[PDB]
Amino acid sequence: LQGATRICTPQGKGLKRLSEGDLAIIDAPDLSRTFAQRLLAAKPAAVLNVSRFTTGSVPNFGPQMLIDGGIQLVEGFGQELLDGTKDGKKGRLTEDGQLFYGERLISNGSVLSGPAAENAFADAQQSLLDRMEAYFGNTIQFIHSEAPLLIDGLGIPDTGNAIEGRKVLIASPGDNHRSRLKELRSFIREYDPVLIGVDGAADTLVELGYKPALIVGNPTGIGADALRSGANVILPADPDGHAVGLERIQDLGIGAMTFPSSVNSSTDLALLLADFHNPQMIVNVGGPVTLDGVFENREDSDPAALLTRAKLGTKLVDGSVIASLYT
Amino acid sequence: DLPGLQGATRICTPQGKGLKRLSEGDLAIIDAPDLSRTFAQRLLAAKPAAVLNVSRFTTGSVPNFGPQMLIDGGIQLVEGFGQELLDGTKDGKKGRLTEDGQLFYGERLISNGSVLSGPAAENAFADAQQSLLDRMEAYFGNTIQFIHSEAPLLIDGLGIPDTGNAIEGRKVLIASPGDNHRSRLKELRSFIREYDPVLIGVDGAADTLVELGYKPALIVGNPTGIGADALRSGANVILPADPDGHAVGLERIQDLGIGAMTFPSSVNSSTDLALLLADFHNPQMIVNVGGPVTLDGVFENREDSDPAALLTRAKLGTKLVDGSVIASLYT
């Protein structure tokens, strides 16, 4: 198959130039229906993917739509497909999945046939059902054994009257939490929310010049400057009351409270603690948890994370939503 | 003297002046169904002789430990007095509570209550704990079934109509006809003016948007329940349809000669359809006004809750913000 080699992204890179009969170069694992529809409307001879069209986690119909439209599908070329592509140059794709610029080999891919794409979809369909049966089975078990915490707030320490009626901002050490905190500088200055630092993000808050009211996490993994900043330290403890890191708190001579529970995440503990104190709102920075993340996780996801987000209900807002008000 | 516990009758609320002056040995009068641990802790610290509830301490939907904390503290619990307890109470007047749960002001009967013993409160807790497990087994069993049969919608957006490029990258505000949605929309006047979000009116809230002087880009719902002014405003009308494509209210749209699209699905709520439609078009954010759905609502329901509602909120993830959060930025 001979045609122009056009690099396409779901955001609209080469979709406007993609003509009938050319070779589309994409990097789209788990190809979305929207991107497949845009590719299908352009009528390309073949879609060459750097990654796999169906990775196996979710049943995505996109690759089958392309095959039904008479488009050749070749996948798993790898980064060398993007590194060796000249946008617009007439390429040549063989029936074996090889891409050439005349007689020069650029990349080797794996041809995805119609029946193989149907099988991958059916396998992903069964995989999602099995993972969701396990996940929501664990959700029922979690609610049953942790109802004292979810319903009564058993174990949640009383941190005083500082949170009630106020805006709260919780910072967790997720990817790019520091740059999100910097985008929220005007928000923090203008609204003066109660700051809660979780684990290593308590260090980040203190390094940015803040004085968090609360710090949540095992003090073993929190810096000395954050622990000595004046914040009330909330230590996760086993349901029996044993708190790891209490010796460090006692060595420092600082005030601390324990939060006995079976919840492993200190971000979920901080969210449940803030909610229990009846705030006006809770801005969650560096701790995002979504349904799509649960569906795409090939490993077991913790039901306590999605249940905590649902428990906070209408009071929860992600830091990215607030930062978009300042863009 | 006449038998029973004698003490001053004081009306207490989970956030009132009654607690701040509730003294040791008083008969606390409350109206707290499913008594919270926080309110039980504040009542316990005051050391009243008895706590008299208008409602039941444990109604049976959730396992609440509060009543047992009071009983462990040596407080007599009497419940189910009804509104006549609040109507017949005089704050600070010395009342008499018999072992049978009767409240008197001397020899005059005010109200009859049911004595809640420690073992009966433990049994009510254990029963509410089993009823909650049964409901959650039913609820999350339906959630698994929903994900399996509706994966083309949740994963691929199958059935979601293409409304054009107006939503992508923009802030979106969806209005549903929940309680006080009009007064929430009025509190968001500065937000709408300052940020110019894409407006989506759901059902009767499309009428509210048009009455407030707005021109919603989209209207979602059965046109049978939407006003003529909203349907003729210039908005693209999205009709909920059965999985087979049958849309109720299509005859009305065709009589008006206006543009419309259908959204075939097994989701019953037009608010969930509007949220799934907005999310599929990749917005910057989705401000949700008049349609709140929470986990506490699922726990408290007792009737069957729709898993599609909570799954929709989780599907939108980090892009979802309640209108009350945005309105708090203007207070």
Author numbering:
A (entry chain H): 16 to 342
B (entry chain A): 12 to 342
Extract from the study:
D,L-endopeptidase RipA is the major PG hydrolase required for daughter cell separation in Mycobacterium tuberculosis ( Mtb ), as RipA defects severely hinder cell division and increase antibiotic vulnerability. Despite extensive studies, the mechanisms governing Mtb RipA regulation remain controversial and poorly understood. Here, we report an integrative structural and functional analysis of the SteAB system, a regulatory complex that has been shown to modulate cell separation in the model organism Corynebacterium glutamicum ( Cglu ) and is conserved across Mycobacteriales .
In addition, crystallographic characterization of the cytoplasmic core of SteA revealed a homodimeric organization harboring a conserved functional pocket similar to the phosphonucleotide-binding site of thiamine pyrophosphokinase. These data, coupled with the in vivo phenotypic analysis of a steAB knockout mutant of Cglu , support a model in which the transmembrane SteAB heterotetramer, driven by cytoplasmic ligand binding, orchestrates the productive periplasmic positioning of RipA, leading to PG hydrolysis activation.
